[PDB]
């Protein structure tokens, strides 16, 4: 009998052992009076996101239609400042519906002006009520000394924000590269917060390992990078000694030209013909796994068209990442296109025949002809469409001074449409596009520096691309 | 200049087994679906398998005719993708083609391979 | 996704608007997206890309091609007809996977 009694007792407490985890109600079906419409509950994709995986509907067509209708929404981002300073070095960068955002403040004209603060800090971009995606502000990180952090740029992984700065007690790091340390500082911004995060909020990161190979400095430079897993790509520029540089003169694109050498092209690698320094773009590679305080590593571009090295910019867009690089040589025709091979760095440029950018008095816009120049402006493009190729950006439509600022969507050999974001006269400089969806369709923010209280002040425009030209 | 080509085609008779591959080049293969469609004089254009990402734990589909049959794979260190189709039936003759997906969009095709059952 | 196309064969004389129509027994819709594609087929070649997304005008693909239609109810529109459209064209549902093809619309020239 006693041993049927234990077979019970255990029949029972093992059979209707039924411990179980809290209920989802967001994910669960919930049925009230006077219901809202159910629909399908899909989270990540209600607010904004990249541009992956949809055949979005654009227009495809050129027309002279005005379908584009920039909306300014400079208030959201802190650059009202006052009437006594400039805005100077912006920083823009968008991935998966956060920003990251800097700039540097300074007093009298920034040209030659005293830095005041230096401004690094994250948010959420989301419609906040006005049906226009704006940009959310929330953490933000003031260095101890703001003379000393340039060139910064951003990556976005796992809720945080990634910031790779360059510091220099010598000034700017390019135009004084020969004294530079070659000291990087990696800040971690969460683009989240809590209450009394510490560390957690705002931490700094030391990279006391930078792997160089041959390039003695190398250096953070572009608005921002990608993320691939466990590991973050920065656009970056290294600084080699111009003796060790090999090329050959012979590849220099000197036909058709009567008016240029075969050594143009490499002399103006450097910031001047004699510079001490030739600069060279790539990436630089942190991998957040590869133990504690992980080293830096430098990944140089393969030479396709090879220019200075100058701003970059590396994004994900529409499944893969796209290389894009400022113009600052005498090859001025817009240089941007997929990413073959990430490390090595290898581009398939795009043959773009119709953007370019204003130069100054050796290399103006549309030349192709090797010259000796250090000479343009960041005039970015965010790719909308891998079918058509489309892109889409701001560019300064003008031939010898940087003005007249200008929105516009565009194949390799085509300009479909565009909207004026400022009249002819008005000076611009550095602009950063970047595109994403919000409500599913393409919205793209623009980040132009546009001349004001005699300064130059940025100015956000929220341009949402027409799916048909009407 | 983006292509796709199909091999391994050919003259198989009923239960036995075949092997297509698709060589790719002009392009990241590494960041793109890619996808079998067949085609019959019976039929037109039938899809027959898909094959996503690594990131997507390289996770596959097929059309009910050819599951359970039909095995497809990729080598992205060789830029190729593998069709193995096993017990071939005569339902199966026609052309294979190779396509790659863009956003979901079968927008470049090979120019196919022949097989006969 | 059932897709069924009509006219099953057009003759089309030259200068002419042919209208291909496709049937969806589902909508093919989501995202704010209608996943209707179509893709021409000509003797000796591979299906390429002629629309997609109903509306997007297709990688090369001339103005006298353009699509229209949501939900369930699309059409493939040609005009003027040239002799260099003599081709199949197929409607495709791209939504959901099984990926489906119609059965295949003939146009020839009269």
């Known amino acids: 009998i006693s041993q049927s009694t234990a077979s019970i007792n255990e029949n029972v407490n093992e059979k209707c052992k039924f411990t179980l985890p809290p209920l989802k109600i967001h994910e669960c079906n919930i049925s009230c009076p006077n219901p809202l419409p159910f629909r399908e509950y899909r989270p990540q994709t209600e607010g904004v996101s990249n541009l992956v995986g949809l055949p979005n509907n654009i227009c495809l067509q050129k027309t002279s239609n005005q379908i584009l209708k920039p909306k300014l929404i400079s208030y959201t981002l802190p650059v009202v400042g006052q009437s006594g300073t400039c805005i100077t070095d912006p920083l823009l960068a968008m991935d998966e519906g956060y920003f990251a955002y800097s700039h540097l403040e300074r007093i009298g004209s920034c040209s030659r002006g005293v830095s005041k603060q230096r401004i690094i800090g994250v948010g959420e971009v989301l419609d906040r009520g006005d049906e226009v995606p704006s940009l959310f502000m929330t953490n933000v990180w003031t260095p101890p000394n703001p003379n000393t952090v340039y060139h910064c740029s951003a990556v976005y992984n796992n809720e945080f924000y990634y910031v790779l700065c360059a510091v220099s007690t010598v000034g700017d790091p390019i135009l004084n590269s020969t004294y530079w340390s070659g000291s990087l500082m990696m800040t971690r911004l969460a683009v989240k917060p809590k209450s009394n995060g510490g560390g957690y909020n705002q931490h700094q990161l030391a990279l006391r390992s930078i792997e160089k190979g041959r390039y003695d400095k190398v250096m953070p430079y572009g608005p921002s990078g990608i993320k691939q897993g466990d590991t973050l790509y920065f656009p970056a520029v290294g600084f080699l000694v111009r003796t060790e540089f090999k090329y050959n003169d012979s590849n220099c694109p000197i036909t058709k030209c009567q008016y240029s050498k075969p050594e143009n092209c490499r002399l103006s690698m450097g910031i001047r013909p004699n510079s001490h320094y030739i600069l060279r773009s790539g990436l630089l590679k942190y991998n957040l796994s590869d133990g504690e305080n992980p080293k830096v590593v430098f990944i140089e571009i393969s030479d396709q068209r090879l220019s200075i090295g100058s701003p970059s910019k590396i994004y994900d867009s529409l499944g893969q990442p796209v290389f894009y690089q400022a113009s600052f040589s005498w090859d001025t025709m817009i240089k941007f296109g997929d990413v073959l091979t990430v490390n090595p760095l290898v581009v398939n440029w795009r043959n773009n025949t119709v953007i370019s950018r204003p130069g100054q008095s050796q290399c103006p816009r549309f030349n192709t002809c090797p010259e000796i120049c250090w000479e343009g402006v960041y005039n970015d493009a965010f790719l909308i469409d891998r079918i058509n190729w489309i892109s889409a950006g701001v560019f300064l439509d003008s031939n010898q001074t940087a003005e007249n600022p200008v929105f516009t969507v565009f194949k390799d050999n085509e300009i479909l449409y565009r909207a004026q974001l400022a009249s002819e006269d008005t000076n611009a400089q550095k602009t950063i596009t970047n595109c994403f969806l919000l409500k599913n369709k393409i919205w793209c923010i623009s980040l132009v520096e546009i001349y004001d209280d005699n300064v130059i002040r940025p100015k956000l425009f929220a341009v949402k691309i027409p799916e048909q030209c009407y | 200049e983006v292509k796709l080509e199909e091999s391994g085609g050919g003259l198989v008779q009923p239960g036995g087994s075949m092997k297509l591959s698709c060589v790719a080049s002009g392009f990241s293969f590494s960041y793109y679906w890619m996808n079998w469609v067949r085609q019959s004089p019976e039929k037109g254009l039938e899809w027959v398998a898909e094959?996503?990402?690594?990131?997507?734990?390289?996770?596959?589909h097929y059309a009910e005719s050819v599951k359970g049959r039909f095995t497809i794979s990729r080598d992205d260190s060789k830029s190729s993708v593998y069709l193995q189709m096993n017990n071939l039936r005569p339902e199966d003759t026609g052309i294979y083609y190779c396509?790659?997906?863009?956003?979901?969009?079968?927008?470049?095709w090979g120019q196919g391979t022949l097989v006969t059952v | 996704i059932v897709l069924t196309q009509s006219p099953a064969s057009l003759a089309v004389s030259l200068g002419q608007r042919a209208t291909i129509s496709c049937r969806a027994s589902?909508?093919?819709?989501?995202?704010?997206?209608?996943?209707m594609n179509w893709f021409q087929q000509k003797p000796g070649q591979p299906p390429k890309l002629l629309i997609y997304s109903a509306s997007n005008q297709g990688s090369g693909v001339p103005a006298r091609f353009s699509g229209s239609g949501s939900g369930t109810d699309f059409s493939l529109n040609i005009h003027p007809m040239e002799e260099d459209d003599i081709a199949m064209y197929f409607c495709?549902?791209?939504?959901?996977?099984?990926?489906?093809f119609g059965g295949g619309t003939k146009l020839e020239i009269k």
């Open positions: 396509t790659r997906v863009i956003t979901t969009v079968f927008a470049y």
């Open positions: 495709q549902q791209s939504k959901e996977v099984p990926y489906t």
């Open positions: 094959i996503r990402l690594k990131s997507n734990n390289y996770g596959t």
């Open positions: 589902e909508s093919v819709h989501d995202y704010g997206i209608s996943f």
